[PDB]
Ligand SMILES: *[C@@H]1O[C@H](CO[C@@H]2O[C@@H](C)[C@@H](O)[C@@H](O)[C@@H]2O)[C@@H](O)[C@H](O)[C@H]1NC(C)=O
């Protein structure tokens with residue numbers, strides 16, 4: 073058993089004599105799928121993964137400067153030129169300053185001032201385009217066996233995991249002791265970027281990532297940083313020097329901006345997808361088993377889940393293992409309407425068996441064997 | 452002779468008092484007959500010692516993470532750390548059942564607290580209109596070779612202006628006393644805030660500073676109680692008993708990027724950008740030195756090639772031969788003998804020390820009368 077007590081839990085019941093069942097999967101939402109004469113299953117979308125993500129850009133967040141060079145001109149002696157202006161690694165700025173006899177020139181006017189610095193990036197993040205072909209959803213399917221350990225165990229070694237990609241959207245999953253289940257999935261959009269920055273991971277929109285005010289480089293191999301002035305600015309000290317100043321690490325700014333995005337290659341908060349379960353090859357274990365004639369004992373007290381279902385963990389006298397569990401629900405006096413666990417069986421005498429049921433509204437009794445459990449499901 | 456060759460330069464012309472407007476970056480040249488011409492600039496404005504409106508925190512660290520969890524129908528989770536102000540906390544609800552250690556199915560409370568302590572912060576000081584000190588430099592048009600455009604070393608004299616003593620008497624050596632009545636009058640008195648951050652300083656608006664997304668404390672100096680700590684510490688919830696803390700990190704670069712739009716004030720508590728200031732110069736005590744001096748009779752010669760300033764004026768730097776001291780004769784001829792001078796009394800205090808003279812040449816092919824009879828003449832095509 074799985075997904076019990078999960079807040080976002082949908083109950084999808086298959087139609088009579090339906091070999092298949094439609095299901096909708098989102099992360100944090102699990103679906104309990106039951107079909108007549110077929111095992112009740114719990115389907116959850118465990119995790120999505122993006123493999124071999126293509127590199128879209130590379131933004132710089134922390135920059136450093138060096139080899140500060142400067143050229144200065146007297147008025148009408150040209151405009152200051154430097155060879156560093158020709159280098160893409162260097163960021164530069166020209167300005168005009170008041171020149172006269174006070175600052176070394178013989179003429180009064182506007183003198184040119186060029187300053188270049190050596191733009192190097194020490195710490196940088198990464199943006200990766202995720203293509204539709206590179207998705208790989210992992211869906212866990214857990215059969216309602218009834219073992220005492222797997223109620224909401226949340227472990228992966230209970231059910232079976234199927235990987236589904238847009239390249240291979242359909243897959244046959246072999247559930248042990250229950251056969252083969254075909255799963256036809258149709259993934260939709262889920263144009264978005266994965267921003268690996270200094271060991272973390274985020275998933276943001278493409279436009280939001282491209283409009284980031286950060287120096288960037290294309291994802292192809294000379295590391296020419298565009299819009300370098302976003303990290304390095306130029307303060308005019310006086311007519312013979314324009315000093316460089318660096319803004320510093322924009323990490324904290326990026327964390328502040330990414331607070332709104334969805335955190336995490338494994339990406340949780342998987343996308344909505346619509347899938348179909350063909351169960352023609354699924355086998356319900358214990359269809360053939362004889363009924364139990366022994367007297368049961370309540371191992372664990374009955375508990376009502378969030379959806380009005382109650383779950384019963386019982387134990388057995390023996391002398392009849394294995395067997396089908398005779399389960400019935402009386403009201404107010406009536407007989408059975410609905411059992412969540414498809415086939416309640418006793419694999420071992422010593423192993424308690426869990427069984428989930430939907431009792432009717434108002435006072436009712438749950439008979440197993442003969443054990444009668446009173447219950448009051450608030451109208 | 453300060454203020455020469457500075458781009459944004461105003462000329463105010465004359466009795467015994469002149470009205471002037473002072474702006475950082477701008478400067479004025481004041482002239483009056485029988486009174487020495489001066490160069491007045493609003494140097495820098497200093498906030499005396501302002502009061503902290505708000506400290507903000509830009510970097511944060513977390514320790515002593517504590518967590519409490521309760522089963523459904525077992526009440527809300529409680530912690531003694533919720534009583535402490537140093538701890539930032541967050542409470543959530545998680546799905547609980549037989550799978551995560553509870554006997555009942557439902558929503559269980561989960562409370563998590565973390566010790567908020569902060570390594571590096573920035574302060575913000577409200578600049579009350581009272582605690583100001585305008586520094587106004589006044590430089591005399593002497594003509595010495597030292598002060599040609601000397602921004603290198605201060606040569607003039609500076610006056611202090613406060614809203615309590617807006618009037619000041621300054622003594623110009625060999626030139627008497629100058630009375631100065633400025634009116635600060637005033638930038639929305641409590642609008643600006645000085646933002647002291649890790650040795651640097653900025654001036655920003657009050658609303659822009661208050662709307663900054665950063666934790667804040669009352670500015671008084673230990674036991675800093677931080678409000679709005681969630682802006683630097685978030686909580687992610689691992690499943691069913693644990694809520695891990697995430698620190699946003701150093702917001703230094705965020706602050707630098709946000710302050711790129713504001714005007715950097717270059718020093719820690721002095722502002723090298725002032726703002727407008729309306730002043731009145733009273734010269735009833737100002738002495739024009741050189742009015743009893745003799746006319747120069749020797750022949751001059753040009754020390755430095757005539758230079759034109761950006762305002763159309765001409766600067767001429769000459770060396771004298773011998774009365775020493777004496778007054779340099781000066782006027783301009785196109786035909787027209789009249790010529791407007793910027794330097795009021797060009798005198799030669801010493802023979803060796805050259806003398807600079809500023810004049811306003813008339814439009815076109817003028818001539819100059821430095822000297823006498825063998826006084827040198829220079830051509831100038833003012834275009
Ligand atoms: C979760 O389950 C663990 C063991 O898993 C299952 O154990 C039995 C029921 C077998 O059916 C085996 O195939 C499974 O792997 C337990 O050790 C553990 O205590 C369980 N935890 C909780 C909270 O129920």
Ligand SMILES: *[C@@H]1O[C@H](CO)[C@@H](O)[C@H](O)[C@H]1NC(C)=O
Nearest residue numbers: 137138139140141155156190
């Ligand atoms: C660059 O600066 C280093 C020291 O910072 C110096 O040793 C080197 O000679 C400089 N070279 C150039 C080309 O500027």
Ligand SMILES: *[C@@H]1O[C@H](CO)[C@@H](O)[C@H](O)[C@H]1NC(C)=O
Nearest residue numbers: 173174596597598601603604
């Ligand atoms: C400016 O003042 C300094 C200080 O003595 C002086 O040495 C220099 O000659 C002056 N004139 C300049 C730099 O043009």
